Amino acid sequence: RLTELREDIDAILEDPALEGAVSGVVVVDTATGEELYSRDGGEQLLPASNMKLFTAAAALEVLGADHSFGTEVAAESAPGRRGEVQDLYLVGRGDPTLSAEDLDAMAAEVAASGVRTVRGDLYADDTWFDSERLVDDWWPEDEPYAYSAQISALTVAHGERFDTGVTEVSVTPAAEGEPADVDLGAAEGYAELDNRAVTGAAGSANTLVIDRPVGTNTIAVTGSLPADAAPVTALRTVDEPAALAGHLFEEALESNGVTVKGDVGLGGVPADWQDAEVLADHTSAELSEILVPFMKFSNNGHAEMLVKSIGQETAGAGTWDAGLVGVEEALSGLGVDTAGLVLNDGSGLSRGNLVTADTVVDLLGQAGSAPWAQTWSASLPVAGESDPFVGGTLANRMRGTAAEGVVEAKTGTMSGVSALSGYVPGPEGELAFSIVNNGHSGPAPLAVQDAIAVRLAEYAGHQAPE
Numbered sequence: 522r523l524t525e526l527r528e529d530i531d532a533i534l535e536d537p538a539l540e541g542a543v544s545g546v547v548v549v550d551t552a553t554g555e556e557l558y559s560r561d562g563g564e565q566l567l568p569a570s571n572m573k574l575f576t577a578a579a580a581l582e583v584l585g586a587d588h589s590f591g592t593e594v595a596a597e598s599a600p601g602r603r604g605e606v607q608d609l610y611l612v613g614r615g616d617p618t619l620s621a622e623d624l625d626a627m628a629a630e631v632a633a634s635g636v637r638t639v640r641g642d643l644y645a646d647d648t649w650f651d652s653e654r655l656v657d658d659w660w661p662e663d664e665p666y667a668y669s670a671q672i673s674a675l676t677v678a679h680g681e682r683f684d685t686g687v688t689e690v691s692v693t694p695a696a697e698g699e700p701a702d703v704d705l706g707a708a709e710g711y712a713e714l715d716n717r718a719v720t721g722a723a724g725s726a727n728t729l730v731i732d733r734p735v736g737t738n739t740i741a742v743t744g745s746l747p748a749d750a751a752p753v754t755a756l757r758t759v760d761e762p763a764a765l766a767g768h769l770f771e772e773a774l775e776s777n778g779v780t781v782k783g784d785v786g787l788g789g790v791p792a793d794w795q796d797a798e799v800l801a802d803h804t805s806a807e808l809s810e811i812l813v814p815f816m817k818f819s820n821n822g823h824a825e826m827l828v829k830s831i832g833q834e835t836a837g838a839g840t841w842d843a844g845l846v847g848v849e850e851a852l853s854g855l856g857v858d859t860a861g862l863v864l865n866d867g868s869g870l871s872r873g874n875l876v877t878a879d880t881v882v883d884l885l886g887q888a889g890s891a892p893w894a895q896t897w898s899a900s901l902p903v904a905g906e907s908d909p910f911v912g913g914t915l916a917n918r919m920r921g922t923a924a925e926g927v928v929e930a931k932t933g934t935m936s937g938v939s940a941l942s943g944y945v946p947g948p949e950g951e952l953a954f955s956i957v958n959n960g961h962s963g964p965a966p967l968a969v970q971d972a973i974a975v976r977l978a979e980y981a982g983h984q985a986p987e
């Protein structure tokens with residue numbers, strides 16, 4: 522039954538979509554350690570978001586499944602008779618799920634400590650990580666988009682998916698020839714708006730563009746929205762995630778009857794502050810739960826935040842250089858041979874990253890041995906599951922096949938890069954596989970990856986639903 526499996530994958534790999542592409546494809550039985558298939562498993566390839574496998578495993582090793590992230594509000598002394606403080610610091614220590622609701626709850630805590638007036642200025646302290654907002658080789662033209670948000674220790678997560686450093690931009694049409702109505706979301710009052718969008722005729726062509734031009738904190742809206750088109754939302758990044766947290770916290774304070782008299786900006790707690798008075802704090806959920814939004818939807822901000830957090834744990838340095846080194850050590854200490862691994866980031870966004878299929882499968886096997894194995898494998902997208910928090914980036918792939926509800930796998934995708942790596946459990950074998958494709962010049966080779974995942978599901982002992 523091995524040869525038939527081998528002949529089938531071979532044939533799948535002949536596909537025209539893989540013309541001039543380099544593909545690493547390795548399949549292994551995790552129980553018997555049997556090698557089932559191996560094509561170019563030592564070839565170094567861009568993994569895209571398959572990099573998160575290495576990041577998540579390292580984060581579980583260094584921080585632990587039980588780890589949580591904190592955010593504080595400090596003043597130099599507690600409020601007095603008159604409920605006054607001077608300057609106020611909002612302090613982020615790497616929470617990637619900190620919401621506007623959580624800012625409100627802390628705002629209510631500030632007020633309940635008996636503060637009525639912030640007489641000085643409000644500061645947003647993100648000094649727990651360094652101020653390097655973006656990886657060196659990330660593309661400036663990708664900067665307006667969510668997967669490319671700036672990295673900070675203090676950042677507001679939008680939605681149940683916890684997309685960091687972004688605002689939700691809405692555009693609603695009016696009558697033909699009148700401007701579109703635009704809303705900036707959280708960044709109303711923080712980012713600038715440049716609205717040039719108009720309402721087009723009903724049944725005309727939608728040509729709306731929402732941008733944030735490079736090096737600006739301006740949301741620029743161009744084009745035309747047809748009078749009958751559905752109202753639109755788009756997540757766009759802001760310059761300085763923490764100064765947005767600052768602005769939003771100013772809003773939550775006032776909502777909770779605390780007047781801010783001064784300004785809002787970035788700044789770190791002074792250090793001539795003798796004994797800061799913590800007036801509010803928040804504690805995230807634990808890493809094991811945070812892994813879900815992070816791995817299902819392949820959340821880039823989360824990955825980089827987790828890397829800088831590794832750095833802080835291992836070295837007191839909230840930094841890509843320290844974290845990445847700690848990612849390798851943790852993988853090493855886990856029994857992973859890291860010879861083929863090149864780490865330029867945690868998310869896989871960077872074109873500086875390199876893996877091999879063997880390294881991936883190596884990681885996949887070594888994780889199952891660890892204490893945190895169940896929580897790790899739970900975070901992985903499940904093929905063909907329509908609940909986004911189950912299927913993740915696999916929700917609309919492999920539906921109505923043997924892989925539906927079985928294949929647990931991480932996706933990864935860029936121009937000329939596509940990867941699918943993970944697990945296929947079954948009565949006929951518990952399988953680990955990695956499929957990494959580079960250099961294809963046509964459609965994304967997802968039909969090839971699916972076709973292999975489905976065939977593996979059949980090997981593991983599952984049936985197509987009918």
Ligand SMILES: *C(=O)C1=CN[C@@H](C(=O)O)C(C)(C)S1
Nearest residue numbers: 569570668819821932933934
């Ligand atoms: C990994 O390949 C990806 C990361 N998160 C998103 C992004 O746009 O970068 C994805 C679309 C899932 S690709």
Ligand SMILES: [Co+2]
Nearest residue numbers: 583584585588
């Ligand atoms: Co810990």
Ligand SMILES: [Co+2]
Nearest residue numbers: 679680689754
């Ligand atoms: Co939303």
Ligand SMILES: [Co+2]
Nearest residue numbers: 707709710711
């Ligand atoms: Co505002």
Ligand SMILES: [Co+2]
Nearest residue numbers: 923927983984
């Ligand atoms: Co089944």
